[PDB]
Amino acid sequence: AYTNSFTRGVYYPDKVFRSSVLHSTQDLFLPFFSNVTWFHNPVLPFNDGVYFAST
Amino acid sequence: NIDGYFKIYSKHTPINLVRDLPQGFSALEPLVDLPIGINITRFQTLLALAAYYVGYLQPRTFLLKYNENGTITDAVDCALD
Amino acid sequence: PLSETKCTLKSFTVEKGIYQTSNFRVQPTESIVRFPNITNLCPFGEVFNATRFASVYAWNRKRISNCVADYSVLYNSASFSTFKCYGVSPTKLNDLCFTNVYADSFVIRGDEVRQIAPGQTGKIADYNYKLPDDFTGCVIAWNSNNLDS
Amino acid sequence: MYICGDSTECSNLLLQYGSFCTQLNRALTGIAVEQDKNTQEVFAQVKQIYKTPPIKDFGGFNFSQILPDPSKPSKRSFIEDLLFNKVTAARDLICAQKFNGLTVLPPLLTDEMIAQYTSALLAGTITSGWTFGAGAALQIPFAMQMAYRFNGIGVTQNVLYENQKLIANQFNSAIGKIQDSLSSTASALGKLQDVVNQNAQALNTLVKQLSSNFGAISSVLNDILARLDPPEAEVQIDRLITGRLQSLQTYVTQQLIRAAEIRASANLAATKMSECVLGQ
Amino acid sequence: LSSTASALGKLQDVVNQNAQALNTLVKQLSSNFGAISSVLNDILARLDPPEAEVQIDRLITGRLQSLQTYVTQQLIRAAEIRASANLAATKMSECVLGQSKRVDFCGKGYHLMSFPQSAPHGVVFLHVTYVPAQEKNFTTAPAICHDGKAHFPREGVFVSNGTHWFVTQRNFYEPQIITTHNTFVSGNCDVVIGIVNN
Amino acid sequence: LSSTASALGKLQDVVNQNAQALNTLVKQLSSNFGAISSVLNDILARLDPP
Amino acid sequence: FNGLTGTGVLTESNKKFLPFQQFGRDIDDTTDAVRDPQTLEILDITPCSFGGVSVITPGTNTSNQVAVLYQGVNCTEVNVFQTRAGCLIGAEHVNNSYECDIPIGAGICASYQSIIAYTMSLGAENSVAYSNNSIAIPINFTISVTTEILPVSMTKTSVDCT
Ligand SMILES: *[C@@H]1O[C@H](CO)[C@@H](O[C@@H]2O[C@H](CO)[C@@H](O)[C@H](O)[C@H]2NC(C)=O)[C@H](O)[C@H]1NC(C)=O
Ligand SMILES: *[C@@H]1O[C@H](CO)[C@@H](O[C@@H]2O[C@H](CO)[C@@H](O)[C@H](O)[C@H]2NC(C)=O)[C@H](O)[C@H]1NC(C)=O
Numbered sequence: 001a002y003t004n005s006f007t008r009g010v011y012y013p014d015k016v017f018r019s020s021v022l023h024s025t026q027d028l029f030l031p032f033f034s035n036v037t038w039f040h041n042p043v044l045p046f047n048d049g050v051y052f053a054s055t
Numbered sequence: 056n057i058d059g060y061f062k063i064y065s066k067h068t069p070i071n072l073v074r075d076l077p078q079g080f081s082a083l084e085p086l087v088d089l090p091i092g093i094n095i096t097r098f099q100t101l102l103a104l105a106a107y108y109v110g111y112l113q114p115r116t117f118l119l120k121y122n123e124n125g126t127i128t129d130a131v132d133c134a135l136d
Numbered sequence: 137p138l139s140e141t142k143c144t145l146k147s148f149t150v151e152k153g154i155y156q157t158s159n160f161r162v163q164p165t166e167s168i169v170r171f172p173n174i175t176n177l178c179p180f181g182e183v184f185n186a187t188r189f190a191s192v193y194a195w196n197r198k199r200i201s202n203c204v205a206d207y208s209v210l211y212n213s214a215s216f217s218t219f220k221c222y223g224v225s226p227t228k229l230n231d232l233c234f235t236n237v238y239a240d241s242f243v244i245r246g247d248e249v250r251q252i253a254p255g256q257t258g259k260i261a262d263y264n265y266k267l268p269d270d271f272t273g274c275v276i277a278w279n280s281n282n283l284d285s
Numbered sequence: 286m287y288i289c290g291d292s293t294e295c296s297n298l299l300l301q302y303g304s305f306c307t308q309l310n311r312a313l314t315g316i317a318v319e320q321d322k323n324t325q326e327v328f329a330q331v332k333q334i335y336k337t338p339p340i341k342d343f344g345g346f347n348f349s350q351i352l353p354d355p356s357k358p359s360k361r362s363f364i365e366d367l368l369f370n371k372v373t374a375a376r377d378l379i380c381a382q383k384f385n386g387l388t389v390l391p392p393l394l395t396d397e398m399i400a401q402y403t404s405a406l407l408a409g410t411i412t413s414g415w416t417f418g419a420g421a422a423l424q425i426p427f428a429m430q431m432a433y434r435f436n437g438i439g440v441t442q443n444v445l446y447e448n449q450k451l452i453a454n455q456f457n458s459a460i461g462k463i464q465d466s467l468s469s470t471a472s473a474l475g476k477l478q479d480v481v482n483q484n485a486q487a488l489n490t491l492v493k494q495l496s497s498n499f500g501a502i503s504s505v506l507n508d509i510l511a512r513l514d515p516p517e518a519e520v521q522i523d524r525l526i527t528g529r530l531q532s533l534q535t536y537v538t539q540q541l542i543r544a545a546e547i548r549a550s551a552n553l554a555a556t557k558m559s560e561c562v563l564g565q
Numbered sequence: 566l567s568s569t570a571s572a573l574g575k576l577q578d579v580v581n582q583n584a585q586a587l588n589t590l591v592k593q594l595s596s597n598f599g600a601i602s603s604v605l606n607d608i609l610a611r612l613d614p615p616e617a618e619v620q621i622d623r624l625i626t627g628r629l630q631s632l633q634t635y636v637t638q639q640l641i642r643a644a645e646i647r648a649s650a651n652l653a654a655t656k657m658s659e660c661v662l663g664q665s666k667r668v669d670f671c672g673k674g675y676h677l678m679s680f681p682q683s684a685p686h687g688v689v690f691l692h693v694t695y696v697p698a699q700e701k702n703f704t705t706a707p708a709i710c711h712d713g714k715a716h717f718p719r720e721g722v723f724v725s726n727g728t729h730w731f732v733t734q735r736n737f738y739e740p741q742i743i744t745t746h747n748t749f750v751s752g753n754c755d756v757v758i759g760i761v762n763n
Numbered sequence: 764l765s766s767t768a769s770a771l772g773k774l775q776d777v778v779n780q781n782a783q784a785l786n787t788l789v790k791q792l793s794s795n796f797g798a799i800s801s802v803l804n805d806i807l808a809r810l811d812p813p
Numbered sequence: 814f815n816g817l818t819g820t821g822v823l824t825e826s827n828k829k830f831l832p833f834q835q836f837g838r839d840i841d842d843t844t845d846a847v848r849d850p851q852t853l854e855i856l857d858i859t860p861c862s863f864g865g866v867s868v869i870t871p872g873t874n875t876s877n878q879v880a881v882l883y884q885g886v887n888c889t890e891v892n893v894f895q896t897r898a899g900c901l902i903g904a905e906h907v908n909n910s911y912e913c914d915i916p917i918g919a920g921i922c923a924s925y926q927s928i929i930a931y932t933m934s935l936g937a938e939n940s941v942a943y944s945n946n947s948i949a950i951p952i953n954f955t956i957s958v959t960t961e962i963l964p965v966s967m968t969k970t971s972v973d974c975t
């Protein structure tokens with residue numbers, strides 16, 4: 001099964017405290033409205049990072 | 056895994072839906088940073104004595120907004136539309 | 137202040153008006169220095185005391201962290217041949233604090249030690265161990281003729 | 286302070302470039318000086334300070350929506366209050382400075398003086414017609430002045446005296462409509478926001494160009510001075526002066542170019558105030 | 566003009582600005598700009614081409630930058646002077662060759678005429694103006710009712726010295742008796758506010 | 764208007780000034796500027812990065 | 814602080830850090846708060862006061878005394894008179910209002926008669942006796958002559974390159 005990941009996978013990029021500011025960053029993120037694959041002991045690829053959700 | 060460093064982030068929140076990922080926004084606070092230096096190409100989960108979604112990250116430019124207390128409230132994906 | 141005004145206008149007569157001469161900044165004193173809370177000795181000595189080295193096609197690497205690194209003790213040694221230290225400077229190395237240190241060790245003939253530097257070509261620099269274009273910490277080559285001769 | 290942040294060696298090295306700093310300071314000072322003459326030529330056209338009498342027998346017109354109100358913060362009127370609220374503050378005390386070397390000076394004329402000038406002009410216009418521009422004020426009833434003003438466009442003066450109430454009601458309704466339009470829509474004041482936006486954006490562009498390598502090894506002077514020996518650090522101190530100098534020169538040139546048009550607009554406003562409020 | 570000075574500040578300011586800019590330009594020729602000497606003759610007579618060319622390059626780029634800055638400032642100043650000259654030509658055309666009806670353009674008051682005079686780098690206008698004085702205030706009325714008819718003045722204003730009514734011009738005080746040759750009738754007077762019996 | 768030449772001068776000077784400015788801008792691309800060669804591809808293809 | 818070098822006054826900061834940051838900041842890389850590596854506490858940093866000076870003088874010809882205006886600085890750490898454009902030293906305060914020659918700023922200006930500073934007077938005040946049944950007509954007139962100067966040109970200068 002496949003599912004839409006609306007706005008999941010946003011983390012803190014750096015160890016710097018900021019407040020009341022809009023910051024433009026460039027890094028490895030999960031694209032918005034991406035296509036996540038439901039699973040159910042299979043070996044999986046690790047391209048450049050893995051977002052691993054759970055329920 | 057970036058240039059010899061292995062980083063793990065995490066989060067834990069309750070949800071009301073029972074079908075899929077809910078609609079909302081919440082940032083992830085880092086837990087573990089390791090200076091290992093070996094590379095990884097494949098991985099495999101482990102069981103105890105269910106389901107799990109797997110997505111892949113890609114290089115992209117985001118625009119984050121910080122609130123008064125320093126917590127991210129929303130973000131914009133530049134390369135969408 | 138009138139003398140300063142005359143200096144600014146470069147004349148002995150000043151007319152009515154308001155002039156801008158200089159500016160003032162509060163002078164700071166009593167400098168303070170804060171550093172981390174560890175005092176362990178660092179194993180830098182073991183790297184140079186290494187009885188065996190490796191070959192250039194497979195060079196030995198060590199990662200150094202959580203140290204109180206002293207370079208004056210190694211700098212003052214007069215047993216080294218070449219110590220051209222790029223990047224920042226030798227004498228100020230004691231006033232800087234880093235995050236990680238990479239130590240790379242091998243052994244090479246005497247005619248190629250001039251070739252361990254960025255921005256140049258050859259055989260060994262291009263096909264055995266290539267330094268990046270930004271910089272290196274710095275390279276230290278010292279004479280050891282009895283060990284492998 | 287902008288080029289060589291609180292350092293000594295950089296200041297010494299900058300002396301070799303001649304005198305590429307009196308020009309920038311002098312140009313900025315000239316702009317700042319003319320920015321006060323611009324305001325002085327417009328409003329400061331009245332000699333005395335007139336004030337409206339307690340008598341409010343104007344024939345039917347009510348000017349209460351534009352005359353000053355004593356129970357106000359700056360003794361302003363309703364329209365001025367709306368205009369102030371519809372334009373997007375460091376005026377509480379002395380808090381204007383910056384670590385980079387940029388400061389904002391306060392204007393010579395505070396807003397209370399501008400309000401007093403406008404009130405004096407309005408009171409003189411209402412109570413003395415156009416006679417207060419040439420010599421001294423000559424009081425004249427408002428209805429007679431309006432009958433004089435119709436005679437200046439062709440219509441005879443018996444039209445006003447027989448249709449006074451209709452004209453008064455139309456004027457009051459028009460004033461109310463202007464009040465409602467100003468209160469509801471806030472996009473009318475589009476000309477006064479462009480200048481503020483341009484100035485703020487240019488200053489932001491100037492500030493944002495300090496964290497640039499320009500070819501050196503770092504964007505901060507202290508770390509270069511605290512890591513390299515000083516018979517070689519002077520090579521990397523250069524390539525940083527030559528960029529921060531060009532940025533400042535570009536900013537100064539753009540400021541001059543966009544101050545010329547403000548001077549032209551100030552001249553136009555002065556002319557309009559001269560031959561459209563005082564006379565007909 | 567003979568006694569009080571500093572009456573020609575604009576021309577003096579223009580000359581001062583021009584001279585100061587030129588002096589600043591000529592003063593930049595003595596800067597090192599990072600080379601070994603500030604004069605080409607010594608550099609050329611003391612070294613060989615391989616690095617003499619570097620020194621010459623440094624000096625050339627510095628001097629070229631200074632020249633460009635000077636030219637830009639001169640362009641801005643010339644534009645401002647052109648605007649001022651256009652204003653002066655307009656003022657001449659309207660005020661010397663005719664009479665100006667636009668207020669405060671030429672002088673403070675009612676304009677009569679003007680005279681031009683030369684200047685070292687400009688022009689001086691002398692404006693002749695008419696200014697009233699010795700005011701006196703009377704009682705007025707908008708119209709006069711005679712036999713049920715409302716009379717208004719053709720040009721002028723109704724005034725009274727206390728017992729009698731006269732018509733006088735606006736800018737000067739000369740009284741005339743009210744006849745039918747200077748007033749015109751418009752209907753009856755029951756809606757006009759301020760009518761007086763006479 | 765249809766007989767005497769050089770009557771619409773000002774527009775002609777404006778057009779000529781714009782054309783001359785654009786031409787002298789596009790003409791500066793061939794200058795050496797103190798480098799080995801004015802062509803960038805060849806100078807990259809003939810020397811090492813340093 | 815661990816290689817971070819700077820100058821300023823250290824104050825007990827109030828902003829709350831998450832347990833994993835090391836130092837805070839704001840727009841355009843201005844370090845605003847730092848945790849010390851020994852006591853773990855948080856301190857905010859701001860530079861101490863600085864700014865320009867100006868000299869107000871009546872001219873060498875008239876007098877040989879001046880006043881000094883420190884721009885944009887609280888005169889508690891520099892008769893001292895506190896203005897809104899800085900603070901003034903060497904000029905006394907008068908509560909009368911005149912027309913002034915040397916402007917300072919924020920409605921405050923100083924002059925010479927010494928070296929007093931006050932608020933500029935807008936102009937003479939009068940009230941016109943308005944009424945709905947009276948007018949005022951002049952009886953006499955005067956002829957006045959006024960002068961005005963306008964520049965039209967400047968010097969023609971040429972500079973060569975070679
Ligand atoms: C930012 O932080 C402040 C303080 O930590 C939050 O204010 C608290 O809000 C909670 C819930 O409304 C109250 O129980 C506390 O009493 C508040 N504390 C104070 C000091 O006011 C605030 O909610 C946070 N978020 C925002 C958007 O300000
Ligand atoms: C190996 O380690 C030892 C001890 O850490 C080093 O011996 C020191 O050498 C210096 C330089 O001659 C002397 O000043 C010290 O007194 C010595 N200390 C001791 C305890 O012997 C030795 O130099 C190291 N060898 C190498 C090749 O690095």
Ligand SMILES: *[C@@H]1O[C@H](CO)[C@@H](O[C@@H]2O[C@H](CO)[C@@H](O)[C@H](O)[C@H]2NC(C)=O)[C@H](O)[C@H]1NC(C)=O
Pocket residue numbers: 341347348349
């Ligand atoms: C002029 O006319 C306006 C329009 O009505 C008056 O404004 C209102 O006046 C009444 C009468 O006192 C008040 O009850 C209202 O509160 C006024 N409106 C507002 C929004 O305040 C105004 O008072 C008149 N002025 C004079 C001097 O008669």
Ligand SMILES: *[C@@H]1O[C@H](CO)[C@@H](O[C@@H]2O[C@H](CO)[C@@H](O)[C@H](O)[C@H]2NC(C)=O)[C@H](O)[C@H]1NC(C)=O
Pocket residue numbers: 451454455
């Ligand atoms: C001239 O136009 C005005 C308005 O444009 C007319 O005045 C209006 O007349 C209507 C009908 O009597 C009234 O309901 C309105 O209240 C009037 N307006 C005002 C402001 O009072 C006027 O009647 C027109 N003239 C003629 C001769 O018809």
Ligand SMILES: *[C@@H]1O[C@H](CO)[C@@H](O[C@@H]2O[C@H](CO)[C@@H](O)[C@H](O)[C@H]2NC(C)=O)[C@H](O)[C@H]1NC(C)=O
Pocket residue numbers: 726727728729
């Ligand atoms: C208002 O003006 C009229 C006309 O000038 C004055 O009437 C004259 O007053 C003088 C005063 O000596 C008499 O000699 C004349 O005979 C009057 N003229 C007529 C036609 O009777 C009148 O006195 C003036 N009123 C005031 C208060 O000065």
Ligand SMILES: *[C@@H]1O[C@H](CO)[C@@H](O[C@@H]2O[C@H](CO)[C@@H](O)[C@H](O)[C@H]2NC(C)=O)[C@H](O)[C@H]1NC(C)=O
Pocket residue numbers: 761762
């Ligand atoms: C001007 O004269 C007319 C006519 O003499 C006056 O109108 C009369 O006034 C009286 C008193 O109020 C009334 O009884 C009459 O009915 C009115 N009409 C007529 C035809 O006599 C008028 O009042 C006078 N105006 C002034 C200001 O005195």
Ligand SMILES: *[C@@H]1O[C@H](CO)[C@@H](O[C@@H]2O[C@H](CO)[C@@H](O)[C@H](O)[C@H]2NC(C)=O)[C@H](O)[C@H]1NC(C)=O
Pocket residue numbers: 378887889895
């Ligand atoms: C000069 O410094 C003093 C000391 O801080 C200032 O006094 C405080 O100023 C702040 C705002 O700058 C106010 O919020 C406080 O209420 C003030 N406290 C006291 C006890 O005065 C003072 O305002 C500064 N400026 C001047 C002109 O004195």
Ligand SMILES: *[C@@H]1O[C@H](CO)[C@@H](O[C@@H]2O[C@H](CO)[C@@H](O)[C@H](O)[C@H]2NC(C)=O)[C@H](O)[C@H]1NC(C)=O
Pocket residue numbers: 424700701702939940941942
């Ligand atoms: C004009 O009439 C008034 C009536 O008194 C006078 O002018 C005013 O005089 C009062 C003093 O009672 C002043 O308060 C006003 O400011 C005056 N109004 C002005 C100057 O506009 C005066 O008597 C009359 N004018 C002449 C020239 O006699």
Ligand SMILES: *[C@@H]1O[C@H](CO)[C@@H](O[C@@H]2O[C@H](CO)[C@@H](O)[C@H](O)[C@H]2NC(C)=O)[C@H](O)[C@H]1NC(C)=O
Pocket residue numbers: 342944945946947
């Ligand atoms: C000003 O206008 C009023 C009327 O608009 C004139 O007379 C008024 O008359 C009534 C009686 O009908 C009185 O109650 C008022 O007191 C009068 N007005 C004033 C202001 O007192 C008045 O004559 C006109 N002229 C002057 C100088 O007031």
Ligand SMILES: *[C@@H]1O[C@H](CO)[C@@H](O)[C@H](O)[C@H]1NC(C)=O
Pocket residue numbers: 002003004033034035
């Ligand atoms: C996800 O992928 C599946 C199979 O490739 C496809 O059927 C589905 O439409 C995709 N969903 C989105 C949102 O792209």
Ligand SMILES: *[C@@H]1O[C@H](CO)[C@@H](O)[C@H](O)[C@H]1NC(C)=O
Pocket residue numbers: 173850851852853
């Ligand atoms: C630093 O070390 C001292 C002495 O061991 C100790 O008292 C202090 O608590 C330490 N600071 C920390 C752990 O933050």
Ligand SMILES: *[C@@H]1O[C@H](CO)[C@@H](O)[C@H](O)[C@H]1NC(C)=O
Pocket residue numbers: 874875
């Ligand atoms: C100097 O001042 C005196 C009196 O104030 C005056 O007469 C004289 O002209 C002044 N000198 C100059 C050069 O202005």
Ligand SMILES: *[C@@H]1O[C@H](CO)[C@@H](O)[C@H](O)[C@H]1NC(C)=O
Pocket residue numbers: 908
């Ligand atoms: C200013 O001086 C006058 C002199 O009489 C005095 O009455 C007044 O109180 C003073 N103002 C202040 C604010 O001290």
